[PDB]
Amino acid sequence: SIVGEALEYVNIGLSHFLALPLAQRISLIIIIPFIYNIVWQLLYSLRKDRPPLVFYWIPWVGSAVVYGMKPYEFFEECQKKYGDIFSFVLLGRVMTVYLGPKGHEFVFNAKLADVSAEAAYAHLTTPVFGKGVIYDCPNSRLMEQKKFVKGALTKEAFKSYVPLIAEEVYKYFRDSKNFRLNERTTGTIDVMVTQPEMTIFTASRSLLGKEMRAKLDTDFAYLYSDLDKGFTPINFVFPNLPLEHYRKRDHAQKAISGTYMSLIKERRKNNDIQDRDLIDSLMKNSTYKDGVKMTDQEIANLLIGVLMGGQHTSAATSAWILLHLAERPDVQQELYEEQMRVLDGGKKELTYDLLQEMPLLNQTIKETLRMHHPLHSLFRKVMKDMHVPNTSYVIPAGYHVLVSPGYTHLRDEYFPNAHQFNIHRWNNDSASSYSVGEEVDYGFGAISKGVSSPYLPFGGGRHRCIGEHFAYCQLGVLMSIFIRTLKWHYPEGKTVPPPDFTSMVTLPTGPAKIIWEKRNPEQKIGGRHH
Ligand code: HEM
Ligand SMILES: CC(C)(C)[C@](O)(CCc1ccc(Cl)cc1)Cn1cncn1
């Protein structure tokens, strides 16, 4: 009755393990975790309190490749096999996806104690934006940061932003190599070159002021290119690697925030604090409710985050608008007629109020944002075990939840013919969004309490967008002028490109080219240029 004889051979076996040839040990350090991975999934599948987990061969990596390249196609397949709730492994993390409006509710309206946005996001935003703001702070501070920024995002602010944005668009048609409307009546542009440039010029001039705008006319502009380099999700896998690239990022953040603090410290020194910018605004209004004031460094880091977030979502969207309208001359024609009616043949100057009377223009943005949500996935880290109601499921702390209103945007059940671009699906519903009923305030204004709308381009709950009206104002001025000034179409055989999902935002796969021509070949844009 000796099991001792077996316990010796355990020890013996361990000793022989340490004496295998390296060719068999390396092999083992590969085969052991691979074998163990597969048996763990097999066993995991039996738990009834866990959503189905998507099968994967490579440990740690998980479904990263397929998710990273075609997330919506990944979601549709998983949805057919497993339904609306499923998990998948992603570079070391377990992601629990909840699709559809009930997913929007589950994730966007999760209790503050259940999930953390900053725990999912901080490890990219912080190196790009700087410390102490956005996701490098507790949620309550973020809530008030959004409140501060919203104080420069009023109707009265938009009324003064409109002519500023319009002047920038005209200067851009006049001076940019991509246009030069005074010298060329037709031409070809890559919209992934023009829109990011037009977006930074207009957003700077209005949110940052003329000083910062003027900086863009110099080599300073390169720093923004550098800073944006660090805003690619190789940095979620690798937040800090001691290579180059990471260093222009860090350098840019320091140099750009330095430029903002310089301006800030000079205004306060010269008593020059008015009501022009987001900068004036945060200088007058950045004291938290417990009495602590934001530092000049935190104010500048917040400016970087706000400008950069708004940079990428808006430029991607005007790119898609131009790309969809280029094969839809009927929509351009219709948008033009609206321009002629609202602006009295173009003899009325565009104002923020006149923008609100251009429903087809706004529906075109609304529709573009339906087909091309610039953020295909929003994440939280689960902080406390979460029960999914009317199910047996429990999402344990340490998991991540993934919500994807952009996927619902593309479902026929909610938007008939969802892959067809049609601005008329929004007739007499041209509002950028609308609180479908009751409201709640998390610290930056009252917003819809329910988040079950299948159309959720600006998310919802405490992390909801506050840039929506600014985006519509900027995209609206932009497109109003494009429409009244140019017609445009594709080179022969070209069509709307597929999205490049691997980036920060769901940009079109470049180069995405369109051919423009002046509606009025003789029209000249005034003002001086080199
Ligand atoms: C077409 C344009 C835009 C779209 C579709 C969009 C979308 C979104 C979404 C979906 C969220 C929620 C993120 C989450 O739940 O994890 C969000 C948050 C936010 N956005 Fe936007 N956005 C746009 C433009 C802008 C602009 C122009 C700005 C700044 C001027 C901006 C600033 C912000 C800020 C400060 C938050 C809050 C983040 C948080 O509370 O965690 N967005 N946006
Ligand atoms: C830059 C911020 C504001 C923090 C951000 O929320 C970053 C959040 C975020 C960025 C990238 C991916 Cl893949 C997922 C989430 C983006 N944004 C939202 N509206 C406009 N930009």
XYZ file of C-alpha atoms and ligand atoms in Angstrom:
594
model
C 0.000 0.000 0.000
C 2.874 2.367 -0.883
C 2.045 5.577 -2.774
C 5.383 6.817 -1.487
C 7.009 4.989 -4.383
C 5.021 7.300 -6.673
C 5.897 10.483 -4.778
C 9.592 9.689 -5.280
C 9.050 9.436 -9.055
C 7.407 12.854 -8.973
C 10.658 14.243 -7.572
C 12.581 12.094 -10.039
C 10.396 13.330 -12.876
C 10.968 16.930 -11.889
C 14.722 16.284 -11.843
C 14.629 14.686 -15.327
C 12.583 17.628 -16.539
C 15.415 19.987 -15.610
C 17.789 17.738 -17.597
C 15.960 17.643 -20.963
C 17.886 18.896 -23.998
C 17.093 22.572 -24.725
C 15.469 21.520 -28.004
C 12.840 19.678 -25.949
C 12.523 22.358 -23.275
C 11.907 25.288 -25.590
C 9.402 23.087 -27.398
C 7.803 22.403 -24.037
C 7.620 26.041 -22.949
C 5.659 26.469 -26.177
C 3.535 23.300 -26.048
C 2.751 23.388 -22.299
C 0.971 26.779 -22.251
C -0.641 26.017 -25.614
C -2.019 22.707 -24.368
C -3.057 24.285 -21.088
C -4.732 27.171 -22.889
C -7.003 24.837 -24.854
C -7.962 22.727 -21.830
C -8.753 25.874 -19.817
C -11.156 27.128 -22.501
C -12.806 23.701 -22.710
C -13.368 23.815 -18.949
C -14.442 27.493 -19.057
C -17.197 26.649 -21.539
C -19.056 24.701 -18.833
C -19.482 27.647 -16.453
C -23.037 28.960 -16.762
C -22.255 32.241 -14.997
C -19.839 33.358 -17.740
C -20.748 34.516 -21.253
C -19.503 32.254 -24.046
C -15.794 32.883 -24.637
C -14.638 33.007 -28.270
C -12.171 30.205 -28.996
C -8.556 31.129 -29.791
C -5.363 29.188 -30.563
C -2.594 31.533 -29.436
C -2.399 32.205 -25.687
C -2.304 35.859 -24.563
C -2.755 37.192 -28.131
C -6.313 35.848 -28.279
C -8.631 37.071 -31.029
C -6.516 40.266 -31.373
C -5.738 39.975 -35.068
C -9.257 39.371 -36.354
C -10.783 41.863 -33.905
C -8.154 44.479 -34.730
C -8.646 44.309 -38.489
C -12.398 43.824 -38.885
C -14.108 44.362 -35.501
C -17.660 44.662 -36.878
C -17.315 41.490 -38.933
C -15.876 39.806 -35.844
C -18.891 40.981 -33.855
C -21.453 39.778 -36.427
C -19.968 36.266 -36.471
C -19.791 36.059 -32.676
C -23.326 37.397 -32.493
C -24.632 34.610 -34.749
C -22.874 31.852 -32.831
C -23.290 33.123 -29.268
C -25.854 35.956 -29.268
C -25.451 39.480 -27.869
C -23.085 38.725 -24.968
C -19.742 37.031 -25.511
C -16.160 37.341 -24.355
C -12.916 37.204 -26.213
C -9.273 37.364 -25.266
C -7.321 40.405 -26.418
C -3.570 40.762 -25.827
C -3.739 39.594 -22.219
C -7.189 41.013 -21.475
C -10.621 39.440 -21.418
C -13.119 41.635 -23.275
C -16.820 41.115 -22.646
C -18.827 42.494 -25.572
C -22.510 43.338 -25.065
C -24.129 44.185 -28.426
C -27.229 46.298 -29.036
C -29.208 48.891 -27.045
C -29.168 46.729 -23.887
C -25.394 46.753 -24.222
C -25.470 50.541 -24.348
C -27.479 50.424 -21.086
C -25.269 47.821 -19.460
C -22.002 49.650 -20.166
C -22.721 53.383 -20.552
C -25.072 53.471 -17.541
C -22.959 51.182 -15.340
C -22.597 52.344 -11.749
C -19.487 54.422 -11.020
C -18.406 51.724 -8.575
C -18.764 48.905 -11.103
C -16.635 50.087 -14.027
C -13.771 52.448 -14.688
C -13.132 54.274 -17.932
C -9.825 55.681 -16.685
C -8.565 52.191 -15.805
C -9.172 51.161 -19.425
C -8.002 54.357 -21.112
C -5.327 56.187 -19.024
C -2.421 54.157 -20.300
C -2.579 55.961 -23.739
C -4.220 59.190 -23.053
C -1.901 60.077 -20.188
C 1.380 59.766 -22.200
C -0.157 61.775 -25.087
C -2.079 64.443 -23.175
C -0.078 64.802 -19.978
C -0.677 64.160 -16.305
C -3.477 65.189 -13.941
C -6.306 65.466 -16.491
C -8.843 63.374 -18.442
C -8.056 59.800 -17.365
C -5.082 60.573 -15.111
C -7.372 61.689 -12.307
C -10.425 60.463 -10.432
C -13.788 60.490 -12.223
C -15.103 63.408 -10.214
C -12.305 65.580 -11.572
C -13.051 64.496 -15.141
C -16.722 65.450 -14.598
C -15.693 68.994 -13.699
C -13.108 69.244 -16.462
C -15.960 68.533 -18.903
C -18.030 71.234 -17.155
C -15.171 73.742 -17.565
C -14.723 72.986 -21.276
C -18.506 73.177 -21.871
C -18.381 76.764 -20.669
C -16.620 77.651 -23.894
C -19.099 75.530 -25.893
C -22.175 77.757 -25.723
C -24.546 79.002 -28.440
C -22.966 82.438 -28.026
C -19.525 80.892 -28.445
C -20.736 79.055 -31.618
C -22.097 82.334 -33.015
C -18.623 83.834 -32.884
C -16.893 80.584 -33.982
C -18.819 80.357 -37.234
C -17.261 83.305 -39.077
C -13.821 82.283 -37.722
C -14.226 78.725 -39.014
C -15.517 80.112 -42.332
C -12.541 82.468 -42.740
C -10.165 79.543 -42.147
C -11.929 77.403 -44.743
C -11.699 80.209 -47.297
C -8.028 80.895 -46.516
C -7.457 77.181 -46.942
C -9.140 77.088 -50.379
C -7.037 80.138 -51.253
C -3.592 79.122 -49.947
C -3.329 75.341 -49.691
C -1.476 73.543 -52.440
C -4.434 71.129 -52.583
C -6.705 73.922 -53.795
C -5.475 77.413 -54.794
C -8.906 78.353 -56.075
C -7.563 81.642 -57.437
C -5.212 79.794 -59.774
C -6.902 76.443 -60.406
C -10.482 75.712 -61.359
C -10.118 71.948 -61.006
C -7.874 69.551 -59.137
C -7.352 66.304 -57.238
C -6.986 65.921 -53.450
C -6.393 63.113 -50.951
C -9.147 63.742 -48.369
C -6.963 62.230 -45.657
C -4.554 65.077 -46.322
C -6.992 67.993 -46.650
C -9.451 67.210 -43.858
C -6.940 66.714 -41.033
C -5.311 70.026 -42.084
C -8.631 71.879 -42.389
C -9.796 70.439 -39.084
C -6.712 71.583 -37.132
C -6.771 75.067 -38.712
C -10.481 75.611 -37.874
C -10.458 73.981 -34.425
C -7.303 75.930 -33.417
C -8.533 79.312 -34.593
C -11.816 78.956 -32.682
C -10.991 76.931 -29.556
C -7.348 78.041 -29.042
C -7.355 81.545 -30.521
C -5.322 83.367 -33.155
C -1.934 83.017 -31.400
C -2.154 79.220 -31.490
C -3.605 79.354 -34.967
C -0.693 81.526 -36.091
C 1.726 78.886 -34.716
C 0.332 76.402 -37.199
C 1.770 78.533 -40.013
C 5.245 77.489 -38.804
C 7.421 74.442 -38.093
C 5.573 74.240 -34.805
C 2.842 72.442 -36.793
C 5.166 69.429 -36.982
C 4.855 68.893 -33.217
C 1.145 68.067 -33.653
C 2.119 65.448 -36.205
C 4.552 64.063 -33.607
C 2.062 64.174 -30.768
C -0.492 62.317 -32.878
C 2.137 59.580 -33.476
C 1.720 58.508 -29.851
C -2.027 58.305 -30.399
C -1.966 54.880 -32.103
C -3.024 51.709 -30.245
C 0.391 50.006 -30.542
C 0.681 52.143 -27.416
C -2.138 50.245 -25.624
C -0.096 47.093 -26.100
C 3.074 49.080 -25.515
C 2.458 52.296 -23.477
C 6.135 53.017 -23.111
C 8.902 51.393 -25.104
C 12.384 52.995 -25.003
C 12.584 53.408 -28.817
C 12.384 56.717 -30.720
C 8.854 57.627 -31.908
C 7.801 57.589 -28.233
C 10.221 60.436 -27.828
C 8.778 62.872 -30.325
C 5.455 62.083 -28.644
C 6.837 62.992 -25.221
C 8.772 65.906 -26.679
C 5.681 67.178 -28.489
C 3.516 66.966 -25.376
C 6.102 68.996 -23.441
C 6.676 71.519 -26.244
C 2.991 71.973 -27.124
C 1.854 72.198 -23.466
C 4.757 74.604 -22.916
C 3.453 76.811 -25.736
C -0.032 76.842 -24.140
C 1.315 77.619 -20.610
C 3.389 80.403 -22.132
C 0.245 81.974 -23.631
C -1.707 81.405 -20.418
C 0.973 82.942 -18.200
C 1.316 85.918 -20.525
C -2.404 86.648 -20.539
C -2.632 86.591 -16.726
C 0.463 88.806 -16.542
C -0.975 91.381 -18.969
C -4.504 91.192 -17.498
C -5.532 90.032 -21.005
C -8.282 87.569 -20.072
C -11.445 88.071 -22.102
C -14.042 85.713 -23.603
C -12.402 84.723 -26.909
C -11.198 81.133 -26.464
C -11.345 77.904 -24.568
C -8.101 79.278 -23.134
C -9.686 82.477 -21.732
C -12.474 80.238 -20.568
C -10.367 77.747 -18.616
C -8.330 80.620 -17.161
C -11.531 82.123 -15.723
C -13.205 78.864 -14.853
C -11.150 75.897 -13.730
C -11.706 75.614 -10.006
C -12.961 72.306 -8.696
C -15.812 72.078 -6.206
C -13.439 71.269 -3.339
C -11.582 74.545 -3.948
C -8.514 73.211 -5.811
C -7.590 75.132 -8.955
C -6.207 73.377 -12.043
C -2.524 74.174 -12.580
C -1.370 75.846 -15.760
C 0.127 72.499 -16.737
C -3.200 70.672 -16.223
C -5.090 73.375 -18.129
C -2.708 72.959 -21.059
C -2.881 69.137 -20.924
C -6.667 69.412 -20.967
C -6.418 71.668 -24.074
C -4.309 69.013 -25.790
C -6.779 66.243 -24.990
C -9.780 68.254 -26.051
C -8.221 69.433 -29.318
C -6.831 66.044 -30.161
C -10.000 64.064 -29.427
C -12.007 66.547 -31.463
C -9.320 66.581 -34.179
C -9.551 62.907 -35.035
C -13.342 62.412 -34.807
C -14.151 65.483 -36.890
C -11.490 65.086 -39.594
C -12.503 61.456 -40.078
C -16.127 62.519 -40.435
C -15.638 65.305 -43.003
C -13.437 62.843 -44.899
C -16.341 60.353 -45.008
C -18.889 63.061 -45.891
C -16.775 64.110 -48.898
C -16.224 60.476 -49.900
C -19.945 59.613 -49.785
C -21.018 62.795 -51.563
C -18.443 62.244 -54.338
C -20.527 59.345 -55.736
C -23.796 61.038 -54.934
C -24.090 64.157 -57.126
C -27.832 64.080 -56.351
C -27.146 64.710 -52.656
C -24.664 67.542 -53.558
C -27.323 69.114 -55.802
C -29.958 68.827 -53.075
C -27.563 70.251 -50.459
C -26.737 73.104 -52.825
C -30.416 74.036 -53.312
C -30.813 74.204 -49.514
C -27.773 76.484 -49.361
C -29.337 78.740 -52.014
C -32.675 78.888 -50.220
C -31.400 79.472 -46.667
C -28.633 81.919 -47.624
C -30.700 83.795 -50.224
C -28.706 82.814 -53.303
C -25.550 83.170 -51.233
C -26.158 86.857 -50.538
C -26.656 86.112 -46.818
C -23.621 85.482 -44.664
C -23.584 82.127 -42.897
C -24.407 82.446 -39.159
C -24.882 79.885 -36.404
C -28.643 80.471 -36.552
C -28.782 79.893 -40.317
C -26.915 76.594 -39.815
C -29.805 75.372 -37.658
C -32.118 75.952 -40.635
C -30.179 73.596 -42.905
C -31.773 70.242 -42.053
C -30.434 68.322 -45.069
C -26.865 69.464 -44.331
C -27.264 68.314 -40.711
C -28.903 65.060 -41.739
C -25.879 64.385 -43.974
C -23.576 64.652 -40.938
C -26.048 62.563 -38.902
C -26.051 59.882 -41.604
C -22.304 59.910 -42.023
C -21.962 59.448 -38.273
C -24.377 56.512 -38.484
C -22.349 54.671 -41.125
C -18.979 55.721 -39.855
C -18.866 55.952 -36.106
C -15.311 57.121 -35.557
C -14.934 55.040 -32.389
C -15.952 51.435 -33.098
C -15.405 50.260 -29.506
C -15.699 51.933 -26.113
C -14.166 50.200 -23.065
C -14.393 50.042 -19.300
C -12.481 47.902 -16.831
C -14.807 45.948 -14.553
C -14.116 46.890 -10.912
C -16.746 44.766 -9.118
C -18.360 41.490 -10.167
C -21.329 42.405 -12.352
C -24.563 40.492 -12.840
C -26.131 40.729 -16.299
C -29.891 40.883 -15.618
C -32.330 38.307 -17.040
C -29.219 36.073 -17.236
C -27.118 33.860 -15.062
C -24.008 35.768 -16.205
C -21.494 37.363 -13.903
C -18.701 39.533 -15.320
C -15.945 39.340 -12.694
C -13.739 42.255 -11.664
C -10.625 42.342 -13.853
C -12.565 41.752 -17.058
C -13.224 44.567 -19.495
C -16.601 45.450 -21.000
C -16.792 46.605 -24.623
C -19.706 48.579 -26.023
C -20.153 49.383 -29.698
C -23.010 51.667 -30.777
C -21.316 51.938 -34.209
C -22.152 48.263 -34.750
C -25.833 48.760 -33.934
C -25.773 51.733 -36.350
C -25.074 49.221 -39.085
C -27.873 46.707 -38.193
C -30.836 46.387 -40.564
C -33.147 45.682 -37.584
C -32.695 49.282 -36.435
C -31.791 51.060 -39.645
C -33.418 49.527 -42.719
C -30.774 49.036 -45.412
C -28.095 50.011 -42.954
C -25.217 49.850 -45.443
C -26.933 52.268 -47.797
C -26.129 55.976 -47.353
C -29.437 57.869 -47.143
C -29.825 61.249 -45.474
C -33.565 61.086 -45.922
C -33.909 58.323 -43.326
C -33.616 61.413 -41.022
C -36.331 63.635 -42.575
C -37.865 65.739 -39.809
C -35.288 64.291 -37.419
C -32.194 66.309 -38.209
C -31.108 66.818 -34.572
C -27.590 65.651 -33.743
C -29.166 63.599 -30.958
C -32.176 64.090 -28.680
C -32.877 63.127 -25.067
C -35.673 60.612 -25.594
C -37.148 61.423 -22.157
C -35.821 61.905 -18.627
C -32.470 63.573 -17.816
C -29.680 63.407 -15.249
C -26.592 65.475 -14.392
C -23.211 63.987 -13.577
C -21.524 67.355 -13.196
C -21.310 68.715 -16.732
C -24.987 69.349 -17.529
C -28.225 67.407 -17.814
C -28.110 64.566 -20.313
C -30.422 61.704 -21.222
C -30.870 59.271 -18.358
C -31.715 56.373 -20.671
C -29.061 55.261 -23.136
C -31.083 52.639 -25.053
C -31.338 54.607 -28.299
C -29.933 52.480 -31.136
C -28.421 55.676 -32.534
C -25.721 56.661 -30.035
C -22.907 58.394 -31.863
C -21.862 60.453 -28.809
C -22.150 57.627 -26.286
C -24.039 58.276 -23.079
C -23.908 58.344 -19.311
C -21.136 60.062 -17.360
C -18.593 59.693 -20.173
C -20.880 61.135 -22.863
C -19.379 63.513 -25.453
C -19.487 67.228 -24.851
C -18.124 68.146 -28.268
C -21.256 67.263 -30.228
C -22.504 70.792 -30.878
C -19.021 72.004 -31.663
C -18.539 69.122 -34.117
C -21.822 69.995 -35.866
C -20.910 73.672 -35.967
C -17.466 72.929 -37.421
C -18.647 70.195 -39.854
C -21.629 72.353 -40.821
C -19.628 75.501 -41.658
C -17.082 73.354 -43.443
C -19.625 71.459 -45.577
C -21.786 74.537 -46.216
C -18.755 76.156 -47.885
C -17.560 73.055 -49.707
C -21.030 72.703 -51.216
C -21.455 76.336 -52.286
C -17.890 76.457 -53.704
C -17.175 73.068 -55.303
C -18.637 70.072 -57.044
C -16.600 66.869 -56.732
C -16.518 63.273 -57.948
C -14.333 60.159 -58.020
C -11.611 59.370 -60.533
C -12.928 56.726 -62.971
C -13.652 53.375 -61.339
C -12.991 54.572 -57.764
C -15.676 54.367 -55.045
C -16.095 54.797 -51.259
C -13.119 53.107 -49.620
C -13.493 50.552 -46.777
C -12.722 51.693 -43.234
C -9.248 51.305 -41.741
C -10.266 50.022 -38.287
C -6.740 49.388 -36.971
C -6.261 53.117 -36.367
C -7.476 55.325 -33.500
C -10.615 56.280 -35.429
C -12.359 54.319 -38.239
C -10.688 56.351 -41.032
C -10.998 55.599 -44.744
C -8.231 53.481 -46.239
C -5.936 55.918 -48.028
C -5.197 57.224 -50.447
C -8.805 58.283 -50.843
C -8.866 60.730 -53.743
C -11.553 62.980 -55.161
C -11.588 65.421 -58.033
C -12.979 68.886 -57.411
C -13.960 71.755 -59.588
C -15.195 75.263 -58.989
C -18.916 75.965 -59.355
C -17.844 79.463 -60.270
C -14.454 79.200 -62.063
C -14.144 83.021 -61.972
C -14.779 83.361 -58.220
C -11.785 84.823 -56.363
C -11.102 84.603 -52.648
C -9.819 87.918 -51.298
C -7.036 88.711 -48.814
C -3.222 88.776 -49.004
C -0.973 85.727 -49.585
C 2.757 85.113 -50.201
C -18.138 63.569 -34.830
C -17.576 63.993 -33.708
C -17.553 63.156 -32.403
C -18.024 61.932 -32.074
C -18.771 60.911 -32.962
C -17.685 61.707 -30.675
C -17.951 60.586 -29.909
C -17.720 60.465 -28.540
C -18.063 59.306 -27.743
C -18.714 58.010 -28.291
C -17.698 59.541 -26.477
C -17.874 58.573 -25.289
C -16.558 57.858 -24.985
C -16.781 56.703 -24.038
O -17.943 56.477 -23.606
O -15.800 55.979 -23.728
C -17.109 60.872 -26.415
C -16.622 61.478 -25.281
C -16.015 62.704 -25.213
N -15.744 63.539 -26.280
Fe -16.451 63.230 -28.269
N -17.020 62.834 -30.209
C -16.939 63.731 -31.240
C -16.385 64.981 -31.220
C -15.811 65.567 -30.122
C -15.273 66.904 -30.088
C -15.272 67.849 -31.323
C -14.787 67.106 -28.842
C -14.120 68.375 -28.259
C -14.356 69.592 -28.772
C -15.037 65.907 -28.057
C -14.705 65.716 -26.731
C -15.110 64.693 -25.893
C -14.916 64.650 -24.461
C -14.224 65.725 -23.575
C -15.528 63.312 -24.007
C -15.628 62.731 -22.571
C -14.734 61.519 -22.353
C -15.076 60.943 -21.006
O -15.915 61.563 -20.298
O -14.515 59.869 -20.640
N -15.673 64.981 -28.880
N -17.119 61.409 -27.691
C -9.556 61.865 -26.621
C -10.724 61.386 -25.751
C -11.757 62.517 -25.696
C -10.223 61.154 -24.322
C -11.351 60.086 -26.340
O -12.546 59.912 -25.569
C -10.435 58.842 -26.221
C -11.174 57.523 -25.952
C -10.821 56.400 -26.900
C -9.841 56.555 -27.871
C -9.518 55.519 -28.732
C -10.181 54.313 -28.616
Cl -9.783 52.999 -29.697
C -11.156 54.130 -27.663
C -11.472 55.176 -26.813
C -11.719 60.112 -27.826
N -12.769 61.039 -28.229
C -14.051 61.056 -27.900
N -14.669 62.070 -28.458
C -13.670 62.667 -29.145
N -12.495 62.088 -29.051
